[PDB]
Amino acid sequence: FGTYYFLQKLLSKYLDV
Amino acid sequence: VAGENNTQLGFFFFRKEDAEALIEKIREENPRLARDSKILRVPMDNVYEVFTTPREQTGLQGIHFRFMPDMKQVAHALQLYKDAGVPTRQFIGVPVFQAEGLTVTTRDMQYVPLFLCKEDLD
Amino acid sequence: XXXXYXXXXXXXXXXXXXXXXXXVHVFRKXXXXXXX
Amino acid sequence: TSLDGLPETQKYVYADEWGFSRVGADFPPGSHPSLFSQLLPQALFAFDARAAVAAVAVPLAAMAAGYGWLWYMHSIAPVWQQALCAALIGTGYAGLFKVAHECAMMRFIPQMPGLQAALGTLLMAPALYSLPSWRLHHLHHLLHTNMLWQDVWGWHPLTKVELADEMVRSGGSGGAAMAAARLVLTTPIKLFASVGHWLRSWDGLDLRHFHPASYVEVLSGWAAPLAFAGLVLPAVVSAGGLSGFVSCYLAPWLVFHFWLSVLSLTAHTAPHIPWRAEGDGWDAGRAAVAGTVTLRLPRPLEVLLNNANYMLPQAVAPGLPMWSAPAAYAVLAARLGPYLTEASMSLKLLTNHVTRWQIYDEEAHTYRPMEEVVDEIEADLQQLAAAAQQ
């Protein structure tokens, strides 16, 4: 579980600059 | 049914199995028209009405509506015909049956019933 | 009008020439048509 | 890099044995698959309306022609005419689905992000695919490309030690699991294994796999598929009966899934491509460029599927538009020619995927046939039993 917490975290950081 | 030199004709079958067999023959040569069929049942009322109309108003250059009685009752009709004394094997029209002395009486008068079916007649 | 019949598979004649082969045989002497 | 540097004669005879148009050269470690994006001209990232509208409306017209042809003779058609219409509609939908997969990575019309997300959702719906789960799985693929035990959203190969473990865990090759694996990886149903991928989306329909600040977006993503299979799928059946469903929906579905599965399977599988676990010799640029394959199509199919086979021009440049994917490839062979790999449409390639390349062994680092592998690990079971009789 929580298997996409981190990828989505980083994608949000980078695409919403 | 299309023919030669621009001819067509309408049909009216006293037993729906005749038209069903006709479109089963249609399926033999045309599957589209055989899926495009639907079976209608109307009295002689409006077909007699359209008989009493200008046929070229709806489009006529050789469309001759005819009837098609079943062969059972026309055979019974012709055996009636030739048990009288003049033996032939051809018929005119659609066979109707009646009986002498027979007449259906109402509360007011004695009307005459007409039977297309010798079975129902007798 | 009238139509002639002969109980033979019975043949029929209109005043094209239907043949009621015991099925049917729509002779001509192709039912590709409809009302308009 | 598995059959790396040696005379090009034997790599060419290998390419002819396998149906491959080329075998790659040597690639050194320490690189980034985004490096070679610096080569492409600054006009290959251009935007234009006509190419995109063609890319969306051409497979649309293919599908529409197929439907019209079918509804013209809805069910009176013979079997192979039905197969032709099914194949045509499935190919048109594969093209529309590639347009979808483009707008999912935000590189189709970045000018309108909302309109393009709505377009991607609408076009993914008829195939029962959720846009955000697809995007997550595709990024998770790009990150772990050809990595062992890590890229499960691609064609993860079945290895040897795990199959021996299952062999012991089932108590022979007569259980349901072993028979299922055999029948799925041996017959042409493998060419449809993408169906299983479709069942691995909907991650249990469980929001506990995602980031909380995304819940309201993930659920809406599962909405457009469900709504479809809740509204349209009934109507069709209602107006077409069981057969009328196996005709206008299920067959184009199997066509699109065939196209998807074969595209991926031939894009990232080959005997000259090893599958290393990272730490034990993995690299990004290496497993990206060296461990890949590009397939050739007839230009009709290439204008239909919308460049559906050019996966590397957009793996070196994740922001490269779709009508420029061939042109960019024109540049790449100019620079990395010796390291590229290529192949063509051939039933021989598929037959070797079906019968020859079935089990991946990490010792020889290549693919082997399944019956030989299964008899030989039965022989190794005989060996370990011989070591176990005393």
Ligand SMILES: CC(C)CCC[C@@H](C)[C@H]1CC[C@H]2[C@@H]3CC=C4C[C@@H](OC(=O)CCC(=O)O)CC[C@]4(C)[C@H]3CC[C@]12C
């Ligand atoms: C019936 C058809 C014509 C219409 C479309 C139906 C789909 C929306 C259904 C059919 C198969 C379903 C899947 C079948 C199996 C599962 C596993 C199930 O989850 C689990 O079993 C949890 C994990 C576990 O038990 O180990 C529920 C989600 C999912 C993906 C289902 C999601 C919804 C799916 C794709």
